[PDB]
Design an enzyme around this catalytic site. Structure first.
Site, PDB file in Angstrom:
ATOM      1  N   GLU A  20      57.604  -9.967  35.956  1.00 54.11           N
ATOM      2  CA  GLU A  20      57.124 -10.965  37.007  1.00 54.11           C
ATOM      3  C   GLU A  20      56.315 -12.066  36.635  1.00 54.11           C
ATOM      4  O   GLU A  20      56.030 -12.887  37.539  1.00 54.11           O
ATOM      5  CB  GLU A  20      56.035  -9.765  37.910  1.00 54.11           C
ATOM      6  CG  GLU A  20      54.709  -9.976  37.293  1.00 54.11           C
ATOM      7  CD  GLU A  20      54.190  -8.878  36.190  1.00 54.11           C
ATOM      8  OE1 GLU A  20      53.179  -8.675  35.647  1.00 54.11           O
ATOM      9  OE2 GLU A  20      55.540  -8.558  35.907  1.00 54.11           O
ATOM     10  N   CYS A  61      54.595  -2.700  31.869  1.00 51.31           N
ATOM     11  CA  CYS A  61      53.390  -2.904  30.816  1.00 51.31           C
ATOM     12  C   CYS A  61      52.681  -1.408  30.634  1.00 51.31           C
ATOM     13  O   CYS A  61      53.175  -0.540  29.850  1.00 51.31           O
ATOM     14  CB  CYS A  61      52.191  -3.889  31.369  1.00 51.31           C
ATOM     15  SG  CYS A  61      51.247  -4.281  29.824  1.00 51.31           S
ATOM     16  N   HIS A  79      55.826  -8.583  30.922  1.00 53.10           N
ATOM     17  CA  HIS A  79      55.853  -8.776  32.547  1.00 53.10           C
ATOM     18  C   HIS A  79      56.825  -9.727  32.965  1.00 53.10           C
ATOM     19  O   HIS A  79      57.007 -10.671  33.055  1.00 53.10           O
ATOM     20  CB  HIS A  79      54.452  -9.580  32.774  1.00 53.10           C
ATOM     21  CG  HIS A  79      53.261  -8.610  32.386  1.00 53.10           C
ATOM     22  ND1 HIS A  79      52.530  -8.041  33.346  1.00 53.10           N
ATOM     23  CD2 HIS A  79      53.028  -8.541  31.139  1.00 53.10           C
ATOM     24  CE1 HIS A  79      51.729  -7.339  32.591  1.00 53.10           C
ATOM     25  NE2 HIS A  79      51.793  -7.614  31.226  1.00 53.10           N
TER      26      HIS A  79
END
Ligand SMILES: Nc1ncnc2c1ncn2[C@@H]1O[C@H](COP(=O)(O)OP(=O)(O)O)[C@@H](O)[C@H]1O
Ligand SMILES: Nc1ncnc2c1ncn2[C@@H]1O[C@H](COP(=O)(O)OP(=O)(O)O)[C@@H](O)[C@H]1O
Ligand SMILES: CC[N+](CC)(CC)CC
Ligand SMILES: NCCC[C@H](N)C(=O)O
Ligand SMILES: [Cl-]
Ligand SMILES: [Cl-]
Ligand SMILES: [Cl-]
Ligand SMILES: [Cl-]
Ligand SMILES: [Cl-]
Ligand SMILES: [Cl-]
Ligand SMILES: [Cl-]
Ligand SMILES: [Cl-]
Ligand SMILES: [K+]
Ligand SMILES: [K+]
Ligand SMILES: [K+]
Ligand SMILES: [K+]
Ligand SMILES: [K+]
Ligand SMILES: [K+]
Ligand SMILES: [K+]
Ligand SMILES: [K+]
Ligand SMILES: [Mn+2]
Ligand SMILES: [Mn+2]
Ligand SMILES: [Mn+2]
Lengths: 1058, 379
Positions: free
Chosen positions: B354, B268, B352
């Protein structure tokens, strides 16, 4: 890669007649696929025995076959069209099953036809319950403790492993067909026997209970590049234990945390990968233990489904369209997203900024002796869908759009009923079709959320919402109309309360509430469906109402608009036939240049496909909801004659409110529908009508009856009484009184009137006599016994009536022919359910023509003036849902019970009939032993039927009275014992496979009840049976034919017309 | 009746109901398409100074729980939703949403036309707004504060949300069965990564541990020299709020790292930092990307991934230095999503990997990062 090139022709396997569990969703899907492939420049061939489908319209494909969906028949189609590939995932289980038979039969090999979308292996992997279970374990997904059975012995052993209650699920079935919940041994044996027989693979899966866990579904699409997306998630309202199709369901899921949703999402994709679905979509089902998030995989459907249709409507993502394109080599990233103006790809996951609710539609009233409790086997006949910004709004809209006369949570029990809580309790604990309303009553009755939960297993998340609505209703009732200030009213509207519901609580007319909203300027806004939560604009006008700030309708000022009102959810008697008409009205008019506006909320239909019209309002078909659209659209005209009873019933009210109703007037409609109004016009026209009375008192009837003469047709449900003693009898259990025309031929006539001329659309002769509902009778176009002389009379009578009643567009007339005398049964000033069949048979798109007439263009002007009489016979046969309700006596009568129909095309009537019968899933054979058991009035003609079967090679069996008559004819049947007689009796013989055919006719409430066993056994054991002598003769005839001998396409049929 | 009002820079008012703290809140207003994951979103540091609007009407259906917090607090400046459900109904819920917001002292409004809001933002782009919740919410005032808002352009927020002092992270990912696991012992983790905290999501860290990384979280402003001293098996550039541009310290550092052979991975904001550090340029998007259904294509493999996005700024593809090769792009708008150094073991992703909340589709991006490490250690 881009499209496949080693493919030019594609055969698409259609779903067949509509049945419980396999309905309109397949026309929508099939039509989408035709459209998709056709757009891609492929040559499309399709088979569908269901004539009331848009996918069978000649202009949708290249080679359309309305033929029985039997492998031998399809083989002849393949042999004759030599398709390169076959797509078997757009036609229900029928299509899956057929694709595999075709494979098994080696037919596919034989003609070098490639299976696309899904492979035979994949399909089996998902359809074979054992296989599926193995795959899950292989991917570490948990499944309920279970076991496979292939015999009752094995079954009994699994039951012994899992205990009761247990869930039985056949391999190769859907819609819970052949399954159920066994609470005991007795029940266990029943269900299991039934499912083993019904399973295409004679295999069951028996599982331990998860009843009460949460039920979820996910619609997945995977491409050949391995791209995979979740198109939609669905949270069932009704918990596990009640089939998804018979459950209230919403989208998206509501009660899963993101963490749980990801696991589910990952599982879904893993399942598709394992099963091997590489080029299309699939529905993956799960169970979740609310207590701990424990995830269980229930099943997977390697095709399009009622859920994928629902999901498509819900999100705006055309699953079937995309899937068909994937089937042909396209990848998701390559395709564009329809509704976002192609601005984005199809490779994404939709996001919605609203709540979708689906509520199933039942018809239990139509099946008296049926078990009306909800289970794992679907019993619903249809469904409605609603869109709201909130769940309450969404839910309430669906209720009011359900077509059951609800305005929302109308009460079921009285507050001041001492036994009310007990009744509620029962309905809650053991869900029936009315559960939703009993939940509301539970709250009014003092029951808590937790108490309701414990009974129903419905998540509290939903329950609290209903309770809040109840408390709001209580306020309304207290404050009355006076208390309906702008602020409060708005609050109520936002929660989805209908004007009608409010009216009842405030003790005012619904119109009062509506005026009140006008005063306050409290009108709904329209939001659009876009698949992306407004992240991207849209050029599509697929909208729903909501009480918000910003309006997204943007009506045009531009065009003359035509509004088409749908019929809502399908029900028996109000099927796809009506939706077919609606669709045609829209395609025609739009093509003619009008701006077409469709109003409907049936998620299964093509009418609610945004491609079908310029503008789609996915709304309840109610006066309130339609008035709001008109308000803002200001259409030129509105068609209320094509959606069945639903819009018909709104005609008067709409006109009164200044709606520009086109076609036959609401007054005109009422003249026909009103017995009295109608009796006068008949009288007016010097036409024949059965003697009638209007009795208020019992003794009044018995006298008036003497006048009329028995037998009698008692219309308040309908019944046929035969004698004075019978009259009382009825009266007890139990008003128009009509002489019943015994031994009469029933005929249907479809026509169009433009005020200048009358066009005869089709004269249909039924096989079953008058007394057997037209909707449940097979019919022939053209007639197969009616003199021209007599048909002409009916034609003249239809013209007389068309003009008199001022028909403008479609009409339908029903007559009865007794002793060379034409009797009028009824007039229906609108599009009838036979319309699609007649259009197919004749090649004339009557709904399109009648639509143009309604809109201003005359028959002369369109060049459709002469009645068409085709060179071949077209026979329509129906499919009955009795197999879904075994307690029900599977006998025909004056009340309609069928769900669907098929069409048979033949050079002779026998051939058309043969194809129609086979298409209807008849188990008729051309050899064996037949059982004759007929009534008095048939004893005479039964001889000739007995001989006919004799000529065929059949051996005969018969009960006493029949045997007597046959003996006197020189026909000596093998005697058979009635059940009270001794042994063996018919039951035993039928149960032991003795018969391949049964003809059993009965007259009289009592006689019927007594013969019940024959019919119920014939059905359970799968023997073909006829309940009419007319039916048996037809059956007789067909034996002389071979339904697989020849096949013809609709294009071909239509080219034969001069 | 507990009023709440939300006013945008353009004077557009939204009158609803207060569902969190009494007070006012000012920030950049954004919309998020995620149908699930509201809590994780709320606790995302990248939301610092941003007023979050969720497109999915019902927000709070599952309540809240500690495992679903991405940070130590609620970063969102405010929360705008359509409907706050009567109840939370999920076995994992430890506290209803309203209670939660109140607890975190968040100004929140419900009952407003979020769709109207959304279309506004998409059509006219991001706007600064103000939410006021109290007895009598003064529109004029609300307009004032919104208008008064500095703006996120050129705003370094990474420094604001960064840890005071460095720390060690050894905790792995959550499991349905196990919940959030006990942190691992140092000897247990193979590699040692140094992570710059630019307002880091706990999930990124957990997912790194998951792959056998022992972490040392460092303040944003930490110097390359200081890091290098640590003998890192790799360096990681976390996600974070604001404009990447103004983060001169970070850029300077990164460049330093890019002179070495150590593996570098940015997520990001870290993606943007890497890019800048390489010679590229960043832009502030019209409305940006906030949702969890965002298709991103791996240009190299020609494979699409549905991903979790949260960014208001991007790296301009057309300014990319030749040592930067494009690895991923949005299928939604074609914007730049991934880059790799043609010459160095440095790559990043705009989205993202994650998730949390969101599709697990981009998780493999981590994998690559390990590869580079494993290979940097082979040396
Ligand atoms: N173990 C179980 N306990 C309770 N209900 C179950 C169980 N397994 C399935 N069901 C119910 O039976 C329904 C039908 O089963 P399903 O596998 O979906 O068969 P079908 O393919 O006929 O739809 C489910 O939608 C669910 O309500
Ligand atoms: N007087 C009658 N004599 C014989 N059969 C009749 C008579 N009236 C009606 N029927 C039978 O009852 C059926 C249904 O009656 P109908 O008036 O058409 O009601 P519906 O509104 O259901 O169409 C007809 O299709 C026919 O089989
Ligand atoms: C579901 C439709 N059938 C099963 C595939 C039975 C009516 C076709 C024979
Ligand atoms: N068209 C009605 C279906 C016929 C059925 N075999 C019966 O005679 O009962
Ligand atoms: Cl089936
Ligand atoms: Cl269990
Ligand atoms: Cl459990
Ligand atoms: Cl039953
Ligand atoms: Cl046979
Ligand atoms: Cl008789
Ligand atoms: Cl608002
Ligand atoms: Cl900029
Ligand atoms: K082929
Ligand atoms: K299945
Ligand atoms: K198991
Ligand atoms: K269910
Ligand atoms: K399903
Ligand atoms: K009939
Ligand atoms: K009728
Ligand atoms: K409001
Ligand atoms: Mn199934
Ligand atoms: Mn199912
Ligand atoms: Mn009728």
């Amino acid at each position: 890669m881009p499209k496949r090139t080693d493919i030019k022709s594609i055969l698409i396997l259609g779903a067949g007649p509509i049945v419980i569990g396999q309905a309109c969703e397949f026309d929508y899907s099939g039509a989408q696929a035709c459209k998709a492939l056709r757009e891609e420049g492929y040559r499309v061939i399709l088979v569908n025995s269901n004539p009331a489908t848009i996918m069978t319209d000649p202009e949708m494909a290249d080679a359309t076959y309305i033929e029985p969906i039997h492998w031998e028949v399809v083989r002849k189609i393949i042999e004759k069209e030599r398709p390169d590939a076959v797509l078997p995932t757009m036609g229900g289980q029928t299509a899956l099953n057929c694709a595999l038979e075709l494979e098994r039969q080696g037919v596919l090999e034989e003609f070098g036809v490639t299976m696309i979308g899904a492979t035979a292996d994949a399909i089996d992997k998902a359809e074979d319950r054992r296989r599926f279970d193995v795959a899950m374990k292989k991917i570490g997904l948990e499944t309920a403790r279970s076991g496979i059975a292939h015999t009752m012995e094995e079954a009994l052993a699994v039951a012994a492993d899992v205990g009761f209650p247990c869930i039985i699920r056949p391999s190769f079935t859907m819609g819970g067909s052949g399954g159920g919940i066994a609470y005991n041994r007795e029940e266990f044996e029943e269900i299991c026997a039934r499912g083993l027989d019904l399973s295409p693979t004679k295999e069951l899966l028996i599982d331990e209970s998860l009843i009460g866990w949460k039920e979820y579904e996910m619609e997945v699409v995977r491409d050949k590049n391995d791209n995979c997306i979740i198109v939609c998630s669905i949270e069932n309202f009704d918990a596990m234990g009640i089939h998804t199709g018979d459950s209230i369901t919403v989208a998206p899921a509501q009660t899963l945390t993101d963490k749980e949703y990801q696991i589910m999402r990952n599982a879904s994709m893993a399942v598709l990968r394992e099963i091997g679905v590489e080029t299309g979509g699939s529905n993956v089902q799960f169970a979740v233990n609310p207590k701990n998030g424990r995830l269980i995989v229930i099943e997977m459907n390697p095709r399009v489904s009622r859920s994928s249709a629902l999901a498509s409507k819900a999100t705006g993502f055309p699953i079937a369209k995309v899937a068909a394109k994937l089937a042909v080599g396209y990848t998701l990233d390559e395709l564009m997203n329809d509704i976002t103006g192609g601005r984005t790809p199809a490779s994404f996951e939709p996001s919605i900024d609203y709540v979708v609710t689906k509520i199933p539609r039942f018809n239990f009233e139509k099946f008296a002796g049926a078990n009306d409790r909800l289970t794992t086997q679907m019993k619903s006949v249809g469904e409605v869908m609603a869109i709201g910004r909130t769940q309450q709004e969404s839910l309430q809209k669906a209720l009011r759009g359900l077509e059951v006369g609800a305005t929302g949570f109308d009460p079921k029990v009285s507050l001041d009923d001492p036994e009310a809580l007990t009744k509620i309790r029962r309905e809650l604990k053991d869900a029936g079709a009315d559960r939703i309303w009993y939940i509301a009553d539970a709250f009014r009755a003092g029951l808590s959320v937790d108490g309701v939960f414990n009974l129903t297993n419905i998540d509290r998340w939903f329950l609290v919402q209903i309770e809040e609505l109840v408390r709001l209703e209580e306020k309304v009732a207290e404050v009355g109309i006076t208390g309906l200030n702008a602020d409060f009213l708005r609050q109520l509207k936002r929660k989805g309360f209908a004007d009608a519901r409010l009216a009842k609580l405030a003790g005012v007319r619904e119109a009062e509430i509506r005026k009140l909203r006008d005063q306050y300027d409290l009108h709904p806004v329209y939001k659009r469906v876009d698949t992306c939560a407004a992240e991207f604009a849209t050029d599509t006008a697929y909208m729903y109402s909501t009480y918000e700030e910003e309006c997204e309708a943007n009506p045009s000022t531009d065009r003359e608009k035509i509004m088409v009102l749908g019929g809502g959810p399908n029900r028996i008697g109000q099927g796809i036939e009506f939706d077919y008409c609606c669709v045609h009205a829209s395609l025609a008019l739009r093509e003619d240049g009008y701006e077409t506006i469709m109003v409907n909320c049936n998620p299964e239909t093509v009418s609610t496909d945004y491609d079908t019209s310029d503008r789609l309002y996915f709304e309840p078909v109610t006066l309130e909801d339609v008035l709001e659209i008109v308000r803002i659209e200001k259409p030129k005209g509105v068609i209320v004659q094509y959606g069945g009873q639903t819009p018909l019933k709104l005609a008067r009210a709409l006109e009164a409110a200044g709606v520009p109703v086109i076609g036959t007037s609401p007054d005109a409609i009422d003249r026909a529908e009103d017995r009295e109004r109608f009796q006068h016009a008949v009288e007016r026209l010097k036409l024949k009508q059965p003697a009638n009375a209007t009795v208020t008192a019992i003794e009044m009837a018995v006298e008036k009856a003497k006048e009329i003469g028995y037998p009698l047709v008692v219309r308040p449900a309908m019944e046929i009484v035969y004698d004075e003693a019978d009259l009382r009898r009825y009266f007890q259990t139990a008003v128009l009184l009509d002489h019943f025309l015994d031994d009469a031929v029933e005929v249907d006539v479809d026509a169009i009137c433009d005020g200048e001329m009358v066009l005869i659309g089709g004269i249909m002769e039924h096989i079953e006599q008058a007394g057997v509902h037209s909707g449940d009778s097979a019919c022939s176009l053209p007639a197969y016994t009616l003199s021209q002389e007599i048909q002409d009379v009916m034609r003249q009578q239809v013209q007389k009536l068309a003009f008199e009643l001022q028909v403008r567009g479609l009409m339908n007339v029903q007559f009865a022919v007794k002793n060379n005398e034409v009797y009028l049964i009824e007039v229906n000033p609108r599009a009838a359910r036979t319309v699609p069949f007649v259009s197919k048979a004749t090649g004339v798109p009557l709904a399109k023509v009648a639509a143009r007439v309604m809109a201003g263009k005359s028959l002369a002007e369109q060049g459709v003036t002469k009645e068409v009489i085709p060179p071949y016979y077209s026979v329509k046969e129906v499919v009955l849902p009795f197999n879904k309700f075994p307690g029900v006596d599977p006998l025909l009568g004056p009340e309609m019970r069928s769900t669907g129909e098929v069409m048979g095309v033949g050079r002779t009537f026998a051939e058309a009939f043969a194809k129609a019968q086979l298409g209807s899933n008849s188990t008729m054979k051309k050899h064996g032993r037949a059982l004759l058991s007929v009534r008095e009035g048939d004893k005479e003609r039964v001889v000739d039927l007995a001989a006919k079967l004799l000529k065929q090679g059949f051996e005969l069996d018969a009960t006493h009275g029949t045997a007597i008559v046959l003996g006197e004819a020189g026909i000596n049947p093998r005697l058979v014992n009635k059940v009270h007689e001794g042994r063996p009796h018919i039951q035993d013989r039928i149960k032991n496979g003795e018969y391949t055919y049964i003809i059993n006719t009965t007259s009289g409430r009592r006689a019927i009840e007594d013969s019940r066993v024959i019919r119920r056994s014939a059905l359970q054991y799968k023997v073909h049976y006829d309940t009419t002598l007319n039916g048996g003769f037809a059956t007789a005839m067909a034996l002389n034919a071979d339904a697989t001998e020849k096949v013809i396409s609709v294009q071909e049929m239509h080219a034969q017309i001069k | 009746i507990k009023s709440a009002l939300l006013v945008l820079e353009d004077g557009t008012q939204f009158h609803g109901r207060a569902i969190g703290a009494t007070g006012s809140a000012v920030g950049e207003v954004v919309f998020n398409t995620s149908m699930t994951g509201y809590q994780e979103i709320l606790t995302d540091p990248s939301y610092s100074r941003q007023i979050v609007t969720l497109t999915y009407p019902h927000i709070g259906n599952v309540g809240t729980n500690d495992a679903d917090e991405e940070s130590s607090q609620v970063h969102a400046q405010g929360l705008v939703i359509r409907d706050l459900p009567l109840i939370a109904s999920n076995f994992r819920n430890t506290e209803d949403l309203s209670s939660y917001l109140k607890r975190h002292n968040i100004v929140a409004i419900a009952d407003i036309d979020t769709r109207k809001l959304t279309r506004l933002l998409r059509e006219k782009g991001a706007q600064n707004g103000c939410i006021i919740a109290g007895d009598n919410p003064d529109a004029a005032l609300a307009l004032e504060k919104a208008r008064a808002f500095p703006g996120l352009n050129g705003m370094d927020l990474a420094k604001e949300v960064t840890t005071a002092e460095a720390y060690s992270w050894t905790q792995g990912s959550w499991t349905l069965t196990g919940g959030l696991p006990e942190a691992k012992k140092e000897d247990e983790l193979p590699f040692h990564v140094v992570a710059y905290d630019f307002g880091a999501k706990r999930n990124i860290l957990r997912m790194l541990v998951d792959r056998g990384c022992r972490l040392t979280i460092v303040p944003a402003q930490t110097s390359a020299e200081d890091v290098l001293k640590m003998n890192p098996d790799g360096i990681f550039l976390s996600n974070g709020p604001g404009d990447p541009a103004p983060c001169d310290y970070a850029i300077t550092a990164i460049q330093k790292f890019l002179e070495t052979d150590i593996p570098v991975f940015g997520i990001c904001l870290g993606h943007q930092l890497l890019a800048l550090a390489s010679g590229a340029k960043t832009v502030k998007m019209k409305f940006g990307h906030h949702g969890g259904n965002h298709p991103v294509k791996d240009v190299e493999k020609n494979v699409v991934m549905i991903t979790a996005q949260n960014h208001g700024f991007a790296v301009d593809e057309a300014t990319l230095p030749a040592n930067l090769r494009v690895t991923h792009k949005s299928l939604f708008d074609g914007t730049l999503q991934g880059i790799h150094r043609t010459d160095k073991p440095a790559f990043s992703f705009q989205g993202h990997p994650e998730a949390s909340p969101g599709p697990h589709d981009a998780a493999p991006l981590f994998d690559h990062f390990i590869e580079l490490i494993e290979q940097y250690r082979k040396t």
